Amino acid sequence: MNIFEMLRIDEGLRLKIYKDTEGYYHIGIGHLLTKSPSLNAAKSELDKAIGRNTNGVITKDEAEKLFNQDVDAAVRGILRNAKLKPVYDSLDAVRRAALINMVFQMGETGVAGFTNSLRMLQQKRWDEAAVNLAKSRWYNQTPNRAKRVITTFRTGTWDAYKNL
Ligand SMILES: [Cl-]
Numbered sequence: 001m002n003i004f005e006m007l008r009i010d011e012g013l014r015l016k017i018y019k020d021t022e023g024y025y026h027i028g029i030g031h032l033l034t035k036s037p038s039l040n041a042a043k044s045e046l047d048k049a050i051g052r053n054t055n056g057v058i059t060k061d062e063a064e065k066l067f068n069q070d071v072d073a074a075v076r077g078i079l080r081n082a083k084l085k086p087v088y089d090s091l092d093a094v095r096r097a098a099l100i101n102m103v104f105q106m107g108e109t110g111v112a113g114f115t116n117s118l119r120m121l122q123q124k125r126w127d128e129a130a131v132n133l134a135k136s137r138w139y140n141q142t143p144n145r146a147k148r149v150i151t152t153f154r155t156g157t158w159d160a161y162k163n164l
């Protein structure tokens with residue numbers, strides 16, 4: 001188990017444009033195309049991202065390319081953020097994956113907003129952080145995924161992703 005396998009479980013794989021739980025156009029392994037309500041806008045973003053006229057469908061190789069790019073971007077976002085980097089640097093490797101997962105889902109800015117949870121993580125107050133993380137729109141909107149990520153922060157193991 002590693003961050004790529006973890007996010008492939010949480011996001012799935014779809015080779016056609018789809019809407020996520022917020023109703024936004026995505027493709028592949030949780031790649032956000034646009035927040036705009038227009039499917040035409042989303043097709044245009046896709047063709048721009050892939051470099052060809054896709055007509056809304058990509059191959060598995062294309063999905064995995066976007067995914068590699070997106071994981072790299074999430075990591076870079078953490079390291080260039082002054083609120084996230086110190087937390088990341090304090091964490092063990094498994095808990096680092098959990099933080100990358102959150103940034104992949106919500107973005108660098110959204111996670112940097114979890115001020116109190118971040119402080120608790122930096123202090124290694126795992127049970128207190130777990131409770132605080134669950135008091136969120138995030139948890140209420142995507143509770144099964146939030147629970148897996150929170151369990152990962154609580155325990156520092158991959159147990160939530162085992163048996164899946
Ligand atoms: Cl892109």
Ligand SMILES: [Cl-]
Binds near residue numbers: 128131132135
């Ligand atoms: Cl709390």
Ligand SMILES: [Cl-]
Binds near residue numbers: 142143145146
């Ligand atoms: Cl969920």
Ligand code: NA
Binds near residue numbers: 030032105106
């Ligand atoms: Na994403």
